[PDB]
């Protein structure tokens, strides 16, 4: 199932929930130990990972550098080692069974260095750095190489996308988005980078457009219904789901759902709660 | 901010 952690609806929250896409309904499960908005959900041997973010509470904004593992049939969270700094509006994708976190913001500076994450070893070390420094950036994996997808690097929002080639450790620039985003939801299904919404500075996006290796091309696709940057995106079962976000106005709850066949994007259910800003993933 | 509502 798909999995939801923390989100920001009036401040941080605790929320660990999973949609069940078969029979319609959320399971409530354990909290997260702290409160986190702009953090980024994956998976490394059926653990559920969440990385980054910050604390944004009546008491305190304080960015994180934390790492926390929950174990599906435990329900139980556990501390693993934090990063080298913290990252709020984080990115992370998983490569040969690591955890790659790249970009995101402390304070007033935007990263452009990215780290990786050793499971069987609880270990961060350095890597190379991005060509751009970018928070609220989409990462995918794709044939074993990672992409950092649009983001926003303190003064302008990003159409561009680089790529990591863990092999060779060097970052290299590929063709750029035709949509300017910041805090989309960034994935892969089919083998196309799919980069759905997000915010240009002037309004939230429905758009959504996909990346062709092989003829290194973007392709617009069919919108979301609804506007909304700072999402949580994952594919189940081939088909793609996002998760709240904001729209400018409100913290959404809607949940769509696109199905590549006909190139159609449905409602499928509305979260317990609108938030933006989740980790999500699937387990 | 305008992009995440927070």
């Given at each position: 199932?798909?999995?939801?952690?923390?989100?920001?609806?009036?401040?941080?929250?605790?929320?660990?929930?999973?949609?069940?896409?078969?029979?319609?309904?959320?399971?409530?499960?354990?909290?997260?130990?702290?409160?986190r908005?702009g953090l980024?959900?994956?998976?490394?041997?059926?653990?559920?990972?969440?990385?980054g973010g910050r604390n944004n509470?009546?008491?305190g904004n304080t960015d994180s550098s934390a790492?926390?593992?929950?174990?599906?049939?435990?329900?139980?969270?556990?501390?693993?080692?934090?990063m080298?700094v913290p990252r709020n509006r984080i990115?992370?994708?998983?490569?040969?069974?690591?955890?790659?976190?790249?970009?995101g913001s402390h304070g007033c500076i935007?990263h452009?260095?990215?780290?990786?994450?050793?499971?069987?070893?609880?270990?961060?070390?350095?890597?190379?750095?991005?060509?751009?420094?970018?928070i609220?950036?989409?990462?995918?994996?794709?044939?074993?190489?990672?992409?950092?997808?649009?983001?926003?690097?303190?003064?302008?929002?990003?159409?561009?996308?680089?790529?990591?080639?863990?092999?060779?450790?060097?970052?290299?620039?590929?063709?750029?988005?035709?949509?300017?985003?910041?805090?989309?939801?960034?994935?892969?299904?089919?083998?196309?980078?799919?980069?759905?919404?997000?915010?240009?500075?002037?309004?939230?996006?429905?758009?959504?457009?996909?990346?062709?290796?092989?003829?290194?091309?973007?392709?617009?696709?069919?919108?979301?219904?609804?506007?909304?940057?700072?999402?949580?995106?994952?594919?189940?079962?081939?088909?793609?789901?996002?998760?709240?976000?904001?729209?400018?106005?409100?913290?959404?709850?809607?949940?769509?759902?696109?199905?590549?066949?006909?190139?159609?994007?449905?409602?499928?259910?509305?979260?317990?709660?609108?938030?933006?800003?989740?980790?999500?993933?699937?387990? | 901010?305008?992009?995440?509502?927070?």
């Open positions: 199932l798909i999995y939801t952690a923390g989100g920001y609806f009036r401040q941080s929250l605790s929320y660990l929930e999973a949609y069940n896409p078969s029979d319609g309904t959320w399971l409530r499960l354990a909290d997260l130990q702290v409160p908005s980024a959900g994956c998976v490394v041997g059926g653990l559920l990972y969440a990385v509470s009546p008491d790492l926390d593992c929950y174990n599906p049939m435990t329900n139980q969270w556990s501390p693993c080692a934090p080298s990115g992370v994708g998983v490569i040969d069974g690591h955890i790659y976190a790249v970009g935007h452009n260095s990215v780290e990786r994450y050793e499971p069987e070893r609880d270990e961060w070390h350095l890597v190379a750095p991005m060509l751009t420094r970018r609220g950036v989409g990462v995918a994996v794709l044939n074993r190489l990672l992409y950092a997808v649009g983001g926003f690097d303190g003064t302008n929002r990003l159409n561009s996308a680089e790529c990591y080639y863990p092999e060779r450790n060097e970052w290299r620039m590929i063709t750029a988005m035709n949509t300017i985003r910041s805090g989309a939801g960034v994935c892969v299904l089919h083998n196309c980078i799919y980069a759905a919404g997000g915010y240009d500075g002037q309004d939230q996006l429905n758009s959504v457009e996909r990346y062709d290796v092989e003829t290194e091309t973007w392709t617009f696709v069919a919108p979301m219904k609804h506007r909304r940057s700072a999402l949580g995106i994952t594919v189940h079962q081939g088909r793609i789901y996002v998760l709240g976000g904001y729209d400018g106005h409100t913290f959404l709850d809607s949940v769509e759902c696109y199905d590549p066949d006909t190139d159609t994007w449905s409602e499928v259910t509305r979260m317990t709660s609108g938030r933006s800003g989740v980790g999500v993933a699937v387990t | 901010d305008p992009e995440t509502g927070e």
